[PDB]
Symmetry: D3
Subunit: 151 residues, 6 copies
């Protein structure tokens, strides 16, 4: 098995374009366990604290704005190397550099409207999870298919 | 347009059988607007109240127990006639009576494992939404395709 | 076999909501032949003759305006009962009476934004076919699968 | 649970048009258990003995021919009311009368090239199963999801 | 944003093997705009100017014959890097070097039956675009999702 | 064309997680020809011989046991470079190293539960086909789209 968690957020462009279910499907079909799921308009404070290590950049202002401009689906997924694998499923930050088959590769175009975020490290993951979710919103259960997903 | 809402819950079998994404995708692609989304283990109290109109039924205690046995995905969806046509999308209560193309017709077999719940009326819907969600959890936004979904 | 034809048009909500590829796909996988396919910004004059049998109706005016308000995907499909069965595939004129499985029942909500036009009759189809398409534009070929599609 | 079995055969037109996996997917996603699966060119004798209760009809000659003209996928599926439900999933014999959402409804056109067969009764089922399969080709195992499919 | 254009053609194997709806779908869901769309039985003269840079090559003769041997779906797609990224989406010229996820990598096998043409450059695209399409036939409109597709 | 064949088996996790249809569908849609298909519980003897080149590996006994723990779908697929490009479709041995768009990249997580086997060479392929199938079980037919898949 493995209880490694990651934080995946669907951005407002992802919501606005009706990509929520498709994105969730990709994680389910892969065998990752859904741990947390909420739908929220994320506050400026939250998005600032979240994207904080990128305050120095000339897209940060417009970033926080856009991320506050609509609703986001906040998710926590569990499984073996979710963080790393999840990021591969996502694709490269820039959808022009994301390979076909990937989420960004398949469904979006420009880096500022790249539909989705996912943690870049297990460090980022736990910070992002504590920041977007309350402990009691992370649900624990066992997949019926656990023994067929994991040795 | 219409601001009518319905309550849709994905039952623990739905979550266990990896249908969250699929189900959300059908509501999205139909043009309906996601208003609330949460992942939780429902308390028996909650469930008993949820299903209070059925307290006098042979299946009630089983229903409550089964509904408490795993996590559910609680959702709120908005649109013209969402309640009535949301139920059409779900199929009949019994998956044997649900037609191919409906969520239950396509994805499940037995009545006690019918994967999804939908409000049966506007009155029920609002009772159910108030019971499962706080109004601040319900997100207001306008679909970018609104004018293309509604005259 | 049968080389009967029908006019199917994907209205501008269809195009705007990105249902072009999906709608074609459903006719293809049914095993109908793509006879002609044009992406046209239609005209009011063009629309009126098409909708002449509805000039008597209140909505007519705005329909023409809506039908005129953005690009359409204009198409001809060849096959046995492509007229009649294609209308079963469209679902009812009102998306709220359209069954899940049908194109409207899956992808839209309101009678006035019902994403797709089909031909009510072969009578209407021939009338319709010639108005949007000249014989030059219509294509003729044999489906490599024809023998497996019809005895 | 329930161990009711049915016999589903994909006809050569269904194989030739690449519909095998899609058909199997429909049964899997529904929750039915795959019991038997073989791929075969079916003998005239077998097809005659199989379609025997229809020897009196003016399509029987051309039927047996066509059914022998290519390979068939022979399947056995298990579950609650599989025979009856399987036939609903299939659709009406004539694809012009099969509803969208159904296998025939979605993927074929003419009754002589209607892609698929499935037993019309539990009587037919067991006869067809003994006739197409050897006992040792019917595999017994338990779905990991059995308790989520069945009460 | 970006209103750059590219020529994408679905070769006659693509059309014969029923991949029209699926290919469009993949460009749509990527969030590119359908500029123009014609189903043409192409000409040898037409094909030669297109394939002029390959007149020096052995296969050229038969390519033109194959390209000429059945209907094509001729299309223009508008978007940011629709030329370049569209070629990543096509996969390599040889389907055997095309990655799974790409259109060729998923749907075809042999270099000489590679189902789809895309533009090697914007240089080539403009050259290509004008040859198959006149300005009348090209459509102009704004995607209701444009704001969510590009910052 | 090409009459090269490969052996593909769906491992018991593949069958348990409802991926039979999905997997077959990818081989079909790619243009490859299904030659043999059988559903069976593999004997340890069979499996030990199947995997004889790996008898000296730390994982061998586990592999055999796991492979014996449920039914597998044994298949034979034909086409130009099926062996090599069949493996490209599967992903890397380790699903963590398999790219999105591949069967393992999309559908599984751990190396010991990597859902599918494909022959690693022509020599292996023929050894494997001879081991799992009798030549009379392998069905010869011509795809109706052959001329459209192969020059
Ligand atoms: N040059 C840019 N212009 C606009 N937005 C950007 C740019 N670079 C990054 N972003 C946005 O900021 C977010 C965070 O950036 P980064 O951490 O580099 O990528 P990722 O989100 O893939 O970890 C990205 O999701 C992206 O949408
Ligand atoms: N006969 C039954 N046996 C077991 N469970 C049942 C039975 N009837 C209904 N249920 C469960 O109770 C839920 C609520 O029942 P009801 O309100 O009658 O149907 P609906 O869900 O269509 O509103 C159903 O979705 C189903 O899961
Ligand atoms: N009550 C209505 N209100 C608004 N628009 C309507 C109404 N009825 C029909 N329409 C529009 O007019 C078009 C043609 O109407 P009609 O010919 O009766 O239906 P159909 O398109 O099913 O043949 C429909 O596709 C629809 O967009
Ligand atoms: N009028 C007809 N013309 C050609 N083929 C037919 C006709 N009627 C039935 N068939 C074929 O014979 C098979 C058996 O017929 P029947 O038992 O009536 O339908 P089903 O297969 O739905 O049980 C059908 O699958 C169908 O393909
Ligand atoms: N070696 C080859 N043998 C046969 N046909 C080829 C070969 N190389 C290319 N072609 C055909 O010629 C077309 C154009 O070739 P080229 O312009 O090099 O590739 P692309 O279409 O990727 O730009 C291809 O789409 C393909 O159908
Ligand atoms: N390190 C491992 N731990 C557990 N199982 C393994 C390991 N490596 C390989 N296997 C299993 O053995 C099978 C055969 O191994 P190998 O031939 O090396 O890979 P491939 O399947 O790519 O040919 C794999 O498909 C996998 O299921």
């Amino acid at each position: 098995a493995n209880c490694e968690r990651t934080f995946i957020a669907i951005k407002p462009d992802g919501v606005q374009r009706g990509l929520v279910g498709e994105i969730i499907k990709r994680f389910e079909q892969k065998g990752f366990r859904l741990v947390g799921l909420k739908f929220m308009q994320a506050s400026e404070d939250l998005l600032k604290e979240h994207y904080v290590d990128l305050k120095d950049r000339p897209f940060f202002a417009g970033l926080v704005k856009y991320m506050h401009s609509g609703p986001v689906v906040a998710m926590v997924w569990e499984g073996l190397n979710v963080v790393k694998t999840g990021r591969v499923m996502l694709g490269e930050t820039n959808p022009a550099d994301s390979k076909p088959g990937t989420i960004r590769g398949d469904f979006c175009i420009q880096v500022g409207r790249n539909i989705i975020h996912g943690s870049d490290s297990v460090e980022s993951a736990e910070k992002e999870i504590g920041l977007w979710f309350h402990p009691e919103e992370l649900v624990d259960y066992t997949s019926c298919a656990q023994n067929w997903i994991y040795e």
